[model samples]
Each structure stands twice: as C-alpha cells, then as structure tokens.
Target: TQACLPVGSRKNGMNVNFYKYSLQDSTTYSDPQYMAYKYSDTKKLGSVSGQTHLSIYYDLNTAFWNTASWSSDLFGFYTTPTNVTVEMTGYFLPPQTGSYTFKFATVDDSAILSVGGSIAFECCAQEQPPITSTDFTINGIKPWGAAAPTDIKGSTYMYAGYYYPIKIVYSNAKALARLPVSVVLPDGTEVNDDFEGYVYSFDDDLSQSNCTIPDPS
Candidate 1:
C-alpha cells in the first residue's frame, strides 16, 4: 500500500509506490491516434484480460527484446513480435511537489500516455523510426527523451497532491524498439525508479482510483 499511505508519513521516509501494467497483444491495438490531452475515447472499455507484472523501468533494448529481461520480471514477448502490443496501467506519486514538466521520448512505433485517466501526452500516432546514427534509433527505438506537457508551462503543477493513474501503450509492429524511455525530472530523479522511491499499481475500475485534480480554469 505504498501509494495508499499518508502523503508525508511514508513508512520511515521509505517509498513503497509501485505499479503493475497490462500487456495487450496486438490483437486489440487498433487505435494509433495522438491525444493532445485526456479524452473519453482514451478510456478502455471491457475487462482487461492481459498479463500482469510489476515494473519500474521501460528500458527495453532491441537486442534485449528476446533476452531474459522479457522472460521474467519483465518476461513477455520474444524477438520483437509484430502486431504485439504493450499497455502498462499503473500509478506513480511525483517526487517534486511543485510545477514541473514530465518528459516522454521514445523510438516507439505507437504510444499513448495518460495521467489520472486523462490524456497527458498523446503520441499514439505511428512515431517515425529513430535515427540509427544517434541515440534515438539504437535498436529501431524512437527519439527517447523527457516527458513534456507544453500547456502546463506557466501553470501550477502539483506532484504529491494525489496518487495519479497512468496508462501507456507501446505497439511495436516491426524491428526492435530499443531501450528508450524517459520519466526524469529537473533534478535527475526518475519517477518510475524503484530505488529512488516506491511505485504501486492501481485497479482499472474508474470509481475506485482516479486523479482528483482541479481544473486550470
């Protein structure tokens, strides 16, 4: 219950926030649209009938796709299977409690990011292959960088205000999308890091768990 614990009174200043994501094989990954912000269509209907695993990092190297990393702990697909999709439904408590920018960079075929059930960064469109010469396309991975919410630039950003829900889907159609994931902050603290802090997964049911954030207006 790391995420469910009192905000400041985390057990011995320890972090227990963790997360478990759902892995949906390519069979049901049809939507490749980028949502600028949270939207109704972004919400997934029907029961989530995918495999479950606790993960902290999204560093999947092209060569490591078929390695042991995808067998246990992160054991899922092997040899970069086409039409196979990946969706992680989890939660994270932001470390910094002020206004900040969350960056996302990837050599991803298609991906979508939502915080608190709302579209935060919608790059669901087919991302072009990363440049092989640079760090972007090391293994066919996209421009992996930081998560940035452009509009929130001059607004007040709250981190510990509430436990946020997060869902990101990566649909790798061909080749290997190497290790290119970013959730780093201004201070270099990775939000999804286990050693840095705790991360807990949340339920798909909307009523039970949702981001209780206020509007900008």
Candidate 2:
C-alpha cells in the first residue's frame, strides 16, 4: 500500500529557486564534475516556497501543466526561457522502509536529481551517452519525447517516518524547461506528479527522528 502524511500536518511544500543568465552557445558536463559547476553570472529571478510538485511543462512555454503551475502563477513568465535554471529542494517522508526508484524525463539540455545528498541521475553531462535529438511532440505540447535520453532513472532507500532531503537542478540550455518525474514506493505504488502528500520543505515539526542518510557528495 502507498503511504501518505497526515493531512494538515505539513506546513510547506518544496522550495524552488529560479535563475536566469545570458544565452550560452554551448555547455558540457561530466557526471558529478559538471553537476558541481556554478554559473558566474546567473541572476536570481525569483524564489518561491510551497511548490508542492514539479511538472514544469508548458504548452508553448507559458501555461503550466496540472502537476506544476508555479512558473506562471508566481513568476508570470514562460517556462522555457533559454539559459534559465531551477533548483528545487525538499524532504521526502516515506511511509515504508524500503528502496524507492524514480524515473525522470527531460527536454532541457541537462539536469541533476539528488537524493540524500547523492547523485541519483545526471543527464547530458557524461561522456559515454550523448543527449537524445528526438523531436518532443505528443497528443498535447509535451516537453520531453519518448526517447532514450528521456529515461533517466535512479533509486535510494529510506526509513519510514524519517525525512530525506531531495533536490533537482535543471539547466535549460535550448529547448523547453520541463522535467517529468515519477517514483515507485516500496509497496509497489507509483506516485506520479503528486508530491504534495509526501514531501515537505519546512524545517520545524517535520519529523520526530533525526535523518540517518549520509551525504554522498
């Protein structure tokens, strides 16, 4: 069975920070090395709290999808602005003690998904596999297409009732600014685009136990 936090117990959702920089001709990444590279001239466009889920897809870079609306609602800007980046942070509170696997798809050039301070998935930065060059079109205006590059998956274990930190970093190089993700619980339940009931960004009163996960960075 799937697990969820009690209603009215969560105070805030995931914290999101948006950044914008001048358009770049090209950028390359190498696993954890490129993941740690920091832009020197990125300006902080805006920062918002309580972003419950992450569906950052837009029809033509304006109207967001059902799972995510913060990009247009809070910033009032299109989601696919070039040379933009986003950092979303939160704590994942699982209901069962087992390994959780997540799958991620991207239209953006590169992205990083970190769980418990460990690199779960890194896209377009490694040397072995190159980014997919598929056209992203579907029933509706979809950001990521059904290609090999869209299938970035990873896993990690966690304890019940404990909070493990999770972070997602996206590098919007040229295409749409969207990253669709889903996770499978220990009980074989799949959580799609709805992270409101399982994630939190607040610091106080979130848990009764200390986090036991190690920092793998």
Candidate 3:
C-alpha cells in the first residue's frame, strides 16, 4: 500500500523544544557533561512549531560566521543563551532513495544528532558517541580546526517515500549559538533551501502523520 505521503510533499515543518536553566553559570566545551545531567523535560521554556530544519542561530551581531546563518535570517531565542539547550525532533522524507551525507556543524558549544534511531554525528561533547555502521559511515572530520566551530559528518541510505526519524540535541555554554544541518543527496545535491518539503514534525497536522505507512527503520 502506498499509504505514505508522496515524495516532495512539503506538508509541515518540524517542532522545536527550547529549554533554559539558570542553575548553572555556563554550559560550554570545558564542561562537556553539563547537559548529560542538567537537561530536564520539566525545564522546557517553550516550543516552536513548523521549523523546516534543525538549523538555528543567533546572528544579531557581526563577528560570527556560519553557513546556515549567512543563508538564513531566522531569529533565535537567547534570553539566556549560555545555559540553554534545544531539542529538535522530526522526520525527513527524501526525494531520492539513496545514500545521504548528513553534515552537522555548530558554533560555540556542542551538538549531537541521530538519524533513523541511531547516533549519527556529534560535535564538542563526547557522550553518546557516534557509532559506525556498514551502510552508514561517520568520519572523524572537524571542518574547522581548533576553532570554536566544529563539524561532524555521517552518511546513511534513505528511501524516497519513507519518513526517517531525526533528532538533534544542541547545548550552548557561551558565545554566539549556531547549529546547522545539511544533507547531501545521493546525486551530490545538498539540501539547503529545499528543506521545506522534505522535513516534518510529529506536532504537525494529521495529514503529515506516518501511522499508515510501514516503518522503514
């Protein structure tokens, strides 16, 4: 049964859950384990619905640089950026059924992401390290050397009509915040501006729900 939404069905955006804590002075690379125990579901300040991608950044100032920030002018919440963590979860539907390279980069602190229910990549923090798979390959590559910005990449096979579960946990300790997620298609096409139709969140309407489709994972 082709009950799943057709490919390129730009139905809905992902949901973003924002959390802030004032109990800690700062959460940064030095204290990598801060988020391991500090993050609480009860501390969620609020959530933003219908986010096309997991990319979020604070670009009000001029002294920072990020691929997504430069391309997008989306505003970010920073009432207390130093001690905040955002949990973004959703499903990604691809236009082509092939291998996709997931590129994750962050500014200031740390970010970890999982695709298809497995830890795919991470930057800054080391807990819940990225795993290696026969079909999925993770490179120990850091796009920026020694600098605050870091990149972790992973590649995985995907189906055109299947909704692959996606999750990213980003923690910020200090400085300007940035988390950019990029997907390179099997045909070497990078999904940047075309995220609108490919991403979906559980909070979205029933039309975007995957209950009828067989779980591809």
Tell me the tens digit of each residue's lDDT in model 1 across 1-217. Answer: 1122222212211111111212322322333332121212333322222323322233455675433233212223332233234444444456666543443433344445445423321111111111111111111223323222321111224456355444445444333432234455546554432312323443323232322343421
Ranking by TM-score: 2, 3, 1
Stronger candidate by TM-score (1 vs 3): 3
Q: Over the stretch 1-217, how does candidate 2's per-residue lDDT look in tens digits?
A: 1122222345566777666633442443212333333531355676677777676653334343212323363234444354566666666778788888877754454566666522321211111111222211110112233332665667776778756656666555443456676788999998887687887764433343332334211
- Residue pairs with colliding backbones in model 2 are none
Pairs that collide in candidate 3 are 10-197, 27-173
All candidates' lDDT scores? 0.33, 0.51, 0.52
What local lDDT does model 1 show for residue 182? 42
CA deviation > 4 Å runs, candidate 2: 1-10, 28-34, 37-41, 59-80, 117-148, 203-217
lDDT of 1 at 37: 16
Candidate 2, residue 36: CA error in Å?
3.5
Can you tell me which runs of candidate 3 are displaced by over 4 Å? 1-11, 21-38, 59-78, 117-146, 204-217
Residue 7 of model 3 has an lDDT of 36
